[PDB]
């Protein structure tokens, strides 16, 4: 057979071979002796030039001008700029291409069918924390679009020799406060205790509710971060109700419309964009299963099961499973009523299978992280459960980066 | 450099040092992770595996370095050097079978690993004799519904000849009859073995739940057909605690999960027929066997009976029917007093096993994709647990189909 990984779908009996993994220049955490695929956190001079050349070759292939004179001239341009300055700069169209390719390359993203549809806001002229705030408000307005959500990324200036980084300190643009209590419990979102306490240390007067929207801590090169409160009318939220269980609304639960990740590094051609927040829309299990039911998050499973009058004293009643299903249904029904874009985990995984087929023909494979792609409820009820996946790192890439404090 | 292993729910960390004892490569390389793949793509070698195993055994009985230990190593060496192979003592076999189960990265039920009845069937010389041993295993393991884990070990592979083999993938399998119009009646997973049975002279049924005969093979002989006596195969009719129409679906499952096509490897010796059995985790039946689209595929039928909106994915009709089916399985097994474990209890016990193994051995090989159950993944503690997958020996392994 072919000397490439053989990939099988066990539902359909079909086979493909991944030839794209051959383009991986970056090693993951696995070896012949042990598989570390389940680990969440996995572990320039002429080094820049080779990454830059590779990226420029990718750009010129995507516009089908590979080997051309415009291609050879751009390469020369890039080496001359690196030769004299130690760094280089992307053309506008190269940035747009690179940002889409970073998304298309993200092995943990189930929403990649959408990858070609991304509004890239070029904010590489930004020179203050105040201006970052203006750019971020504009992004939120555009992406929210009164509930008809639109994928977007805003790109701030790249890391530069000596000079400090542009950083957004918050992990997302919208986050609920988590307030550590006297008894050691948490009011609000326990995921956000640290960022909440940083906001207070930097002068934010804290609230005391379960769904208090945090301010943003924004850092321009070589300055302490500055605190910015989002105007409330800019942050679209959806109160949660259930279509048949009338008491569910009385629980006072809610979630924000716009998932906007702000702490990842965008790498393109060896250039590093340390502030490049990106947004799309939610898959309903992110809110209904993880955010609301993780024991270390809002942890509402027992409260909902009690309201549903389930037997919470024994595992074999399946009280957890029944409650989780209703909470996910409430999320879907409430977003739908509110006319805010959301996708259920069946529709999302079906579209991801279509994406895998598109990419098989386009590039000879698709890097995918099975543990992350399979949804956290109803795993084998979705087609992705039955699909083998090959995980590898391609650049352009979204990467984790250390916290700025 | 050893792997740092994190639990994300609790924030706790351990370090796997056991993985350094692995001698067999898995599918992954630094370039690409192949962890989600279901299947894998001389005398001095045997001697080193033999020694390492004999060393494991004597260490387990705390007699590591005794004259009994040195003499046994000499026996193994003398036998390999003269004949190119050797034979296990019954007590070593018992230790090796338990160790293979303990080492199985895909097994969520390993809290039980020390509790395994081992039937030595190495004095078997005919398919006829294999059938008698298999019947006694079933009878013992079933135990009127009070299920007991067991393994029966038939004669090892030998350089000269064909293997002892059980052709069926489990001791209990429902037939799948392929229609002229492509479709399947019964279990679509068993179409191929069904056809093999018919071709070897079995008079087929035409039901959805027809229990298959066994195809048993002695070395270099055609396999022989053996019908299991109906009273040996305990089955559970499926009903629902509150939905009365559910019983009307005529659904049922067998009590005893007994895997019969894996190879047991101990000290470099290979046991090509070594069927093993325990009890079911309820999602195996309620989620996979009954709801996989390529298995009995009953989700739509159940959803319709529940009057659910089948027109749209966002009604979560599939999720709702699946939960009720898993509940019907749990309820019916409990009613019939047949051992079963739900996915919550099983995964909680596996967390305890991880902790026991950390203290005992400094790690535990586990395959996250197989450990996390197929419904309600993140509702179980194993979802939030990082896991390191690697191959230790003694081991259970896949082998080629004998046809
Ligand atoms: C269009 C709608 C989209 C949907 C429904 C979606 C869905 C998801 C989901 C469910 C995850 C896993 C999140 C988690 O478990 O916390 C994810 C991961 C990710 N997605 Fe998306 N996605 C979308 C658009 C985007 C966009 C626009 C980008 C960036 C341009 C993006 C890049 C990512 C990245 C980088 C990750 C991985 C995060 C990590 O490794 O920690 N996706 N996607
Ligand atoms: C005592 C009750 C037991 C329970 C509840 C249990 C549970 C499970 C489950 C749910 C699986 C995954 C099955 C699938 O998805 O098809 C599994 C895999 C496995 N278990 Fe167990 N187990 C038990 C006892 C045993 C015993 C007695 C052995 C052998 C002595 C064993 C060895 C294995 C092996 C080798 C696999 C992997 C099969 C493969 O890789 O294809 N387990 N276990
Ligand atoms: N942040 C760190 N570690 C870390 C700590 C806790 C959790 C994690 C894992 O990150 C995920 C949180 N559990 C991030 O998930 C948020 C997310 C990401 C991507 C898409 C998401 N959902 C969407 N639907 C979209 C967001 C944007 C476009 S689509 C949500 C990582 C590190 C610091 C230094 C090195 S790593
Ligand atoms: N036939 C092959 N292997 C193969 C083919 C298709 C699927 C598979 C995967 O096997 C699993 C079926 N999906 C086996 O699952 C049955 C099983 C295994 C272990 C435990 C099980 N459940 C229990 N509760 C127990 C059974 C025994 C004790 S506990 C069930 C393996 C090969 C082809 C080429 C080389 S090998
Ligand atoms: C240990 C494990 O890797 C971890 O809990 C993963 C599992 N799969 C996931 N899948 C997604 N989409 N998001 C996650 O946060 C996780 N968490
Ligand atoms: C492709 C994927 O690895 C495959 O569907 C696996 C996933 N996890 C599983 N987990 C268990 N316990 N049993 C299985 O058969 C599978 N199948
Ligand atoms: Zn791996």
Short mmCIF file of N, CA and C and ligand atoms in Angstrom, two decimals, chain A residues 10, chain B residues 38-39 170 257-259 261 276-281 284 370 398-401, ligand 4:
data_model
loop_
_atom_site.label_atom_id
_atom_site.label_comp_id
_atom_site.label_asym_id
_atom_site.label_seq_id
_atom_site.Cartn_x
_atom_site.Cartn_y
_atom_site.Cartn_z
N UNK A 10 -15.16 3.79 10.19
CA UNK A 10 -15.69 2.48 10.56
C UNK A 10 -17.20 2.37 10.35
N UNK B 38 -8.02 2.43 15.04
CA UNK B 38 -8.47 1.22 15.76
C UNK B 38 -7.48 0.04 15.66
N UNK B 39 -6.90 -0.14 14.47
CA UNK B 39 -6.00 -1.27 14.18
C UNK B 39 -4.56 -0.82 13.87
N UNK B 170 -16.80 -13.30 19.15
CA UNK B 170 -17.28 -13.51 20.53
C UNK B 170 -17.94 -14.87 20.62
N UNK B 257 -20.39 -11.06 27.75
CA UNK B 257 -19.49 -10.59 26.70
C UNK B 257 -18.22 -11.42 26.78
N UNK B 258 -17.95 -12.22 25.76
CA UNK B 258 -16.80 -13.13 25.81
C UNK B 258 -16.03 -13.07 24.50
N UNK B 259 -14.94 -12.33 24.52
CA UNK B 259 -14.14 -12.05 23.33
C UNK B 259 -13.24 -13.24 22.99
N UNK B 261 -11.37 -13.78 19.67
CA UNK B 261 -10.43 -13.69 18.54
C UNK B 261 -9.10 -12.96 18.82
N UNK B 276 -11.80 -14.67 26.65
CA UNK B 276 -11.95 -14.10 27.98
C UNK B 276 -13.29 -13.41 28.12
N UNK B 277 -13.82 -13.37 29.34
CA UNK B 277 -15.14 -12.77 29.56
C UNK B 277 -15.22 -12.04 30.89
N UNK B 278 -16.09 -11.04 30.97
CA UNK B 278 -16.30 -10.31 32.21
C UNK B 278 -17.78 -10.03 32.29
N UNK B 279 -18.14 -8.75 32.33
CA UNK B 279 -19.54 -8.33 32.23
C UNK B 279 -19.58 -7.06 31.39
N UNK B 280 -20.77 -6.65 30.97
CA UNK B 280 -20.92 -5.48 30.09
C UNK B 280 -20.96 -4.18 30.88
N UNK B 281 -20.41 -3.13 30.29
CA UNK B 281 -20.78 -1.75 30.64
C UNK B 281 -21.99 -1.40 29.77
N UNK B 284 -22.14 -0.17 25.99
CA UNK B 284 -21.73 -1.09 24.92
C UNK B 284 -22.97 -1.59 24.16
N UNK B 370 -10.96 5.28 23.82
CA UNK B 370 -11.72 4.07 24.20
C UNK B 370 -12.23 4.10 25.64
N UNK B 398 -4.52 -7.98 18.64
CA UNK B 398 -5.21 -8.48 17.45
C UNK B 398 -4.35 -9.46 16.65
N UNK B 399 -5.00 -10.36 15.92
CA UNK B 399 -4.30 -11.27 15.00
C UNK B 399 -5.12 -11.43 13.70
N UNK B 400 -4.50 -11.94 12.61
CA UNK B 400 -5.30 -12.06 11.39
C UNK B 400 -6.49 -13.01 11.52
N UNK B 401 -7.57 -12.75 10.80
CA UNK B 401 -8.68 -13.71 10.70
C UNK B 401 -8.17 -15.01 10.04
N1 LIG C 4 -10.33 -8.50 12.72
C1 LIG C 4 -9.47 -7.52 12.97
N2 LIG C 4 -9.66 -6.71 14.02
C2 LIG C 4 -10.76 -5.92 14.19
C3 LIG C 4 -11.68 -5.68 13.16
C4 LIG C 4 -12.79 -4.87 13.38
C5 LIG C 4 -13.00 -4.29 14.64
C6 LIG C 4 -12.08 -4.52 15.67
C7 LIG C 4 -12.29 -3.91 17.03
O1 LIG C 4 -12.81 -4.94 17.88
C8 LIG C 4 -13.87 -4.57 18.76
C9 LIG C 4 -15.21 -4.52 18.03
N3 LIG C 4 -15.57 -3.15 17.74
C10 LIG C 4 -13.99 -5.65 19.82
O2 LIG C 4 -14.96 -5.26 20.79
C11 LIG C 4 -15.48 -6.34 21.54
C12 LIG C 4 -15.07 -6.19 22.99
C13 LIG C 4 -13.71 -6.20 23.34
C14 LIG C 4 -13.32 -6.11 24.68
C15 LIG C 4 -14.31 -5.96 25.66
C16 LIG C 4 -15.68 -5.95 25.32
N4 LIG C 4 -16.66 -5.77 26.25
C17 LIG C 4 -16.69 -6.32 27.47
N5 LIG C 4 -17.42 -5.75 28.43
C18 LIG C 4 -15.90 -7.56 27.73
C19 LIG C 4 -15.56 -8.66 26.93
C20 LIG C 4 -14.76 -9.54 27.67
C21 LIG C 4 -14.46 -9.21 29.01
S1 LIG C 4 -15.23 -7.69 29.33
C22 LIG C 4 -16.05 -6.06 23.97
C23 LIG C 4 -10.97 -5.34 15.45
C24 LIG C 4 -8.28 -7.35 12.08
C25 LIG C 4 -8.12 -6.99 10.74
C26 LIG C 4 -6.77 -6.96 10.34
C27 LIG C 4 -5.83 -7.29 11.32
S2 LIG C 4 -6.72 -7.64 12.78
#
